[PDB]
């Protein structure tokens, strides 16, 4: 039920650059129950980082989770042109769960 705000709202960076995004809550503070997702138009969302400390199956090393406090941060080392999509933070600690609003990256 933690209301999550994802920042920055929009991005426009050259491909191959290093980017970092953050998401914020105001409910109960958990660190290892957060996951990051990316949804393409017309396709189901795919998982990137689970628990803010472990990669999933097949995930490249470009994604890197960070943050020790209530903030949840992700970093992408290089922006290969297929990465332009929306990102979502999700928590599992709390009562009936709420997604974020989504951060969209543009070329």
């Amino acid at each position: 039920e933690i209301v999550l705000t994802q920042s920055p709202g929009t991005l426009s960076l050259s491909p191959g650059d290093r980017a970092t995004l953050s998401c914020r809550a105001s409910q109960s503070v958990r660190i290892s129950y957060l996951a990051w997702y990316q949804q393409k138009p017309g396709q189901a969302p795919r998982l990137l980082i689970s628990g803010s400390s472990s990669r999933a199956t097949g995930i490249p090393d470009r994604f890197s989770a960070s943050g020790s406090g209530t903030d949840f941060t992700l970093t992408i080392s290089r922006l290969e042109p297929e990465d332009f999509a929306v990102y979502y933070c999700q928590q599992y600690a709390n009562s009936p769960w709420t997604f974020g609003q989504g951060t969209k990256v543009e070329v």
Partner: protein, 123 residues
């Protein structure tokens, strides 16, 4: 391979109930595995609906979805049935079911599997 297959998009009418299901290829509901349901509207943020425990049988529902949606699981066929009553024009969206690779009580805290979703529209 470990993959999820869901039914096709459907069109329905007001004042009617809809049953939605999604199956798996080589994956079984078993005892420990559990899945959640998510909904995506046209250019809207994702909304969580509910998730179920196949083994124990416990269920969790959204406070706003506490009167017209029911989720049930069958271990034998390893199937999931959602009954939604009185779907409106705001309920026209794409549904997805997600479960982790959880066999012999060995599964991470992320939902790797992801179905294609069903586009349900009611006019």
């Amino acid at each position: 391979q470990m993959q999820l297959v869901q039914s096709g998009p459907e069109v329905k009418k007001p004042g009617t109930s809809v049953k939605v299901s999604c199956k798996a290829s080589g994956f079984t509901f078993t005892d420990v595995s559990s899945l959640q349901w998510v909904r995506q509207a046209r250019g809207q943020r994702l909304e969580w609906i509910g998730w179920t425990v196949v083994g124990t049988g416990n269920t969790n529902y959204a406070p706003r979805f506490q009167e017209r949606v029911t989720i049930t699981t069958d271990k034998s066929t390893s199937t999931a049935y959602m009954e939604l009553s009185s779907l409106r024009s705001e309920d026209t969206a794409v549904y997805y079911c997600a479960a982790p690779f959880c066999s012999e009580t060995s599964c991470s805290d992320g939902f790797d599997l992801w179905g294609q979703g069903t586009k349900v529209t009611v006019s």
